[PDB]
Amino acid sequence: EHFKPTGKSFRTGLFAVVLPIALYAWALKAERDGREEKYRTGQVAYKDRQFKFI
């Protein structure tokens, strides 16, 4: 009832969740893509694959 997109609220909400989600979702995509690239290229011998049983 007393909420208004006043910029302070947007600035509050922006850094509150959206960027932690965006920055961290970016980190997950980045790290897995690098790790995935090795596997697709055939870099890691099956001896050295981590979490064989996950």
Partner: protein, 446 residues
């Protein structure tokens, strides 16, 4: 399987005969016992009957409902005490249970959807009919309209699958892998809502805070699982598409779990706090589920069973306190250890289970989702540490604050705990531990 269905159908007339409230649960408890004997299931479907089967996955979820739906009758004895349309109330649960049994026991995807949502309307009557506070309207719509808004588009995604597969049966679907981006969003955004996901959870705190005790049980007990159960059946043929957008869901749920835990610490309502605790754990369930690994799948199935029993359990205790103190706010509810010390024991055990305390079945499932997530990416250790830390931060605040301090001053005299309440709490927690012995069955559905 029809043994269960026809048993329930012929128990419908018991709603009409008078002075049959208590004879109903016994028929509802006895059938659970009968259902408890027919466990000879496997990964593949078994006991076919015209379209109704059951595998190890469906069995545990069905048996969970029969147990929970039976406890609803114990918990809602106030409806019997005031003859507040008890006959209609009974018919609502008997109908609701039948929809659940069919939903899990359905072998074809179209049926699952057919009874998926259809169970909603018996729930919607439950909230409006027997809810106290005026907000059951403004919470009645949220439950109905979030679900319908995202389930109706799912119906299109289901039909588009006939024209390719030619059938709905789950086993025949797994042979295919689809590549269409929108179809992925038309069979998971419909279940991501009901899990719920962190950003689309706005209905959950409203439905649970306003619904009656019984409605709180089933809403937290089985409705949050129909979203989870549905995913377990439809990521089988969305494996390829799941890899392109999973990182979006994992991040949201993981970060969503942490942020909600802080929101839990700033709550002041018992019902609200327990409801927000549901989103916290359901974030881990969804996170591990989308990891798609053997552990993340078996673990997710386990935790859904355990969490439902617990969160359903914790809604008993809030109702017990609310029934006497008359207010559900934390400020009113203090030092209950000094009014109802016998009750405080059950507060602890159910509370401890919620924070993944041993030897509960909850810790077995949580160990596994944690394993799958870590294997998915070592970066997930950051919040997965925070989320498990804060998942106890509010649980202690829930338990300690409501039980420990000095008693409220304005409270008027009220009855002490009754045997019914204690028996209700035992049936919630005691299976939640003994199930660890035979996790053999309620874990390896794959």
């Amino acid at each position: 399987m029809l043994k269960i269905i026809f048993f329930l159908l012929f128990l419908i007339p018991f709603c009409f005969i008078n002075n049959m409230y208590w004879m109903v649960q016994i028929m509802m408890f006895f059938i659970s016992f009968i259902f408890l004997l027919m466990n000879n299931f496997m990964n593949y479907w078994s006991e076919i009957s015209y379209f109704l089967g059951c595998d190890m996955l469906s069995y545990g979820l069905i048996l969970l409902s029969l147990w929970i739906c039976s406890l609803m009758l114990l918990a809602s004895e106030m409806i019997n005490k005031h003859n507040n349309y008890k006959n209609l109330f009974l018919l609502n649960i008997i109908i609701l249970l039948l929809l659940l049994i069919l939903t899990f026991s359905s072998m074809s995807l179209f049926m699952f959807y057919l009874f998926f949502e259809s169970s909603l309307i018996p729930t919607l009557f439950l909230i409006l009919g027997w809810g106290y506070q005026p907000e059951r309207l403004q919470a009645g719509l949220y439950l109905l309209f979030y679900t319908l808004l995202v389930s109706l588009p799912m119906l299109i995604g289901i039909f588009y699958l006939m024209n390719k597969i030619g059938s709905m049966n789950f086993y025949l679907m797994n042979n295919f892998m689809f590549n269409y981006d929108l179809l992925y969003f038309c069979l998971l955004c419909a279940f991501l809502v009901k899990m719920p996901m962190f950003l689309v959870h706005l209905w959950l705190p409203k439905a649970h805070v306003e619904a009656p005790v019984s409605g709180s049980m089933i809403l937290a007990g089985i409705m949050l699982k129909l979203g989870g159960y549905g995913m377990l059946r439809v990521i089988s043929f969305l494996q390829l598409m799941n890899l392109k957008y999973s990182f979006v869901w994992i991040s949201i749920s993981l970060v969503g779990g942490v942020l909600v835990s802080l929101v839990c610490l700033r709550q002041t309502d018992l019902k609200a706090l327990i409801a927000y605790s549901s989103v916290a754990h359901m974030g881990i369930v969804l996170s591990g589920l989308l990891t798609m690994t053997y552990w993340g799948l078996c673990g997710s199935y386990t935790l859904m069973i355990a969490h439902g029993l617990c969160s359903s359990g914790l809604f008993c205790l809030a109702n017990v306190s609310y029934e006497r103190l008359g207010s559900r706010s934390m400020l009113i509810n203090k030092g209950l250890l000094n009014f109802m010390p016998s009750m405080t024991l059950w507060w602890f055990l159910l509370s401890s289970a919620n924070m993944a305390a041993p030897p509960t079945l909850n810790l077995l499932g949580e160990i596994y989702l944690l394993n799958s997530i870590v294997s998915w990416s070592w970066i997930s250790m950051i919040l997965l540490s925070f989320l498990s830390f804060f998942s106890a931060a509010y649980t202690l605040y829930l338990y300690s604050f409501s039980q420990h301090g000095k008693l409220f001053s304005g409270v008027y005299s009220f009855s002490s705990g009754k045997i019914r309440e204690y028996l209700l709490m035992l049936l919630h927690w005691l299976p939640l531990n003994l199930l660890i012995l035979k996790s053999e069955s309620f874990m390896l559905w794959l």
